[PDB]
Write an enzyme that holds these catalytic residues in place. Structure first.
Site, PDB file in Angstrom:
ATOM      1  N   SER A 138       0.777  -1.236   0.000  1.00 13.83           N
ATOM      2  CA  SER A 138       0.000   0.000   0.000  1.00 13.83           C
ATOM      3  C   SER A 138       0.814   1.293   0.000  1.00 13.83           C
ATOM      4  O   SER A 138       0.268   2.353  -0.334  1.00 13.83           O
ATOM      5  CB  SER A 138      -1.026   0.011   1.132  1.00 13.83           C
ATOM      6  N   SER A 152      -6.378   2.266   2.910  1.00 15.22           N
ATOM      7  CA  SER A 152      -5.704   1.424   1.917  1.00 15.22           C
ATOM      8  C   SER A 152      -6.663   0.624   1.038  1.00 15.22           C
ATOM      9  O   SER A 152      -6.537  -0.602   0.917  1.00 15.22           O
ATOM     10  CB  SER A 152      -4.706   0.484   2.592  1.00 15.22           C
ATOM     11  N   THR A 190       1.137   3.532   5.490  1.00 15.20           N
ATOM     12  CA  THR A 190       1.436   2.134   5.808  1.00 15.20           C
ATOM     13  C   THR A 190       1.435   1.211   4.578  1.00 15.20           C
ATOM     14  O   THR A 190       0.911   1.573   3.494  1.00 15.20           O
ATOM     15  CB  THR A 190       0.407   1.551   6.797  1.00 15.20           C
ATOM     16  N   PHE A 212       1.435  -3.419   3.817  1.00 20.14           N
ATOM     17  CA  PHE A 212       1.397  -4.787   4.365  1.00 20.14           C
ATOM     18  C   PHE A 212       1.115  -5.757   3.224  1.00 20.14           C
ATOM     19  O   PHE A 212       0.037  -5.734   2.642  1.00 20.14           O
ATOM     20  CB  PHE A 212       0.320  -4.902   5.463  1.00 20.14           C
ATOM     21  N   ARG A 220       4.715  -1.759  13.213  1.00 14.54           N
ATOM     22  CA  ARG A 220       5.206  -0.967  12.090  1.00 14.54           C
ATOM     23  C   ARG A 220       5.125   0.551  12.362  1.00 14.54           C
ATOM     24  O   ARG A 220       5.830   1.339  11.715  1.00 14.54           O
ATOM     25  CB  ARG A 220       4.495  -1.357  10.784  1.00 14.54           C
TER      26      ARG A 220
END
Lengths: 244, 247
Positions: free
Chosen positions: B49, B97, B188, B190, B232
């Site tokens: 993302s 996201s 962020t 993932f 994170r």
């Protein structure tokens, strides 16, 4: 169109505050307020004037760009938090009066008048000296006018480049949550007297989901201890409206 | 950037949580970076993302995204996450996201234009193999933490091969925390939990404007369990707090 909402009165009475909140969903074509008369009553903008001053600074090239740093000369300033180099966002957020006084001086009276006419900014009355008309001179703007001005800024519809409007909009971010984004500016003309109170402002807009809310708050103030009410009254109203 | 140094004392924050990861932190004025792990700072991972940053810029630049006020309407069909099942603004789509929103953007940009801009942007290995709508999440694109901060600095300075206006629009869409002293812009990423022996990657990248200074950062870590995902942010947040940058 402005509609009176009586339920908002409770926040004012509980604090014994004479003030007004103007809130508009989507656009300023239909706003709501606690007080129809005061919504259109005109007050000194004080530091809320930093919003158009910043745009004008940028448009005239007085502020070279988004990344300009306003260097402190080491000379005394009225508040310690102003005694440091500042970015545009920083100068806006600590309300660095002397930075903006010098921007105004360089803009000059002719250009300042022109832009306030383009922006339809209040009574457009800049008399009182170029470096103090918003703080102690004749310039007056209402909560309704604040909201119209802010909406134009939000939509990039002011007579200024889109670029300069984005630069200033970023400098106005004051709260970021996952749910919503707040762009806002405070102002405070001073304490005046018991008989002639100063004014305190909080103006801006909130973006929540796919919606936008334009807001302007002002109150009479004669004691600086009452200052936080300029945020807690409108925040409480917007919290119960389900906005923030 | 001008330079990089390894500061192994940040490893404590990683050790405390048994995390294999890298933090890169760069001071703009001095052009100098520090990292806990020079080797990993240069290793290239799926951006996941975090690719929504360049993708947003490209969507705007190509006219695929009309302006900062575009609403990406939900068609009504089920999505992989409930939080995506709604109309979303640009910042909205970015902040939750919303993969499908950005997959459609990419489809409309197309491979030739996507390839052009990632070259212009010096974005990772610039490899968009895997499908126009999944190269960043399960295809061949890889980017290092060092390249992330370079990319982000270019964006901050409006130096990317894109209009100032479009970079300005994406920057404001990336604001995640505002304090009176500092502004944080972040994203962020993932890629999944992968396997035990081949973990996924999780990112947090961005920059902090504090007084007249700017700090570009990029964090990544191996992840094999979604419960670890909050690390994170907390690990680099803790490092930046101990550096006196945030909090």
């Amino acid at each position: 169109s402005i509609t009176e909402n009586t339920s908002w009165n409770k926040e004012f009475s509980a604090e014994a505050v004479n003030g007004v909140f103007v809130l508009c969903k989507s656009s300023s074509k239909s706003c709501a307020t606690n007080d129809l008369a005061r919504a259109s009553k005109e007050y000194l903008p004080a530091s809320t004037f930093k919003i158009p001053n910043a745009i004008i600074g940028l448009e005239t090239g007085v502020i070279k760009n988004e990344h300009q740093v306003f260097k402190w000369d080491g000379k005394p300033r009225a508040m310690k938090q102003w005694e440091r180099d500042l970015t545009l966002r920083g100068a806006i957020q600590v309300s660095a009066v002397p930075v903006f006084q010098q921007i105004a001086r360089e803009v000059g009276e002719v250009r300042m008048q022109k832009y306030l006419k383009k922006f339809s900014y209040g009574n457009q009355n800049i008399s009182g000296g170029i470096d103090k008309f918003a703080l102690e001179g004749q310039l007056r703007i209402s909560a309704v006018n604040q909201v119209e001005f802010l909406e134009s800024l939000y939509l990039n519809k002011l007579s200024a480049s889109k670029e300069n409007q984005l630069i200033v909009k970023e400098a106005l971010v004051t709260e970021a949550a996952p749910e919503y984004l707040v762009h806002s500016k405070t102002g405070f003309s001073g304490v005046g007297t018991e008989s002639n109170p100063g004014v305190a402002w909080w103006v801006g807009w909130v973006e929540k989901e796919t919606e936008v809310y334009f807001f302007a708050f002002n109150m009479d103030i004669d004691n600086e201890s009452k200052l936080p009410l300029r945020k807690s009254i409108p925040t409480k109203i917007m919290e119960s409206e389900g906005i923030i």
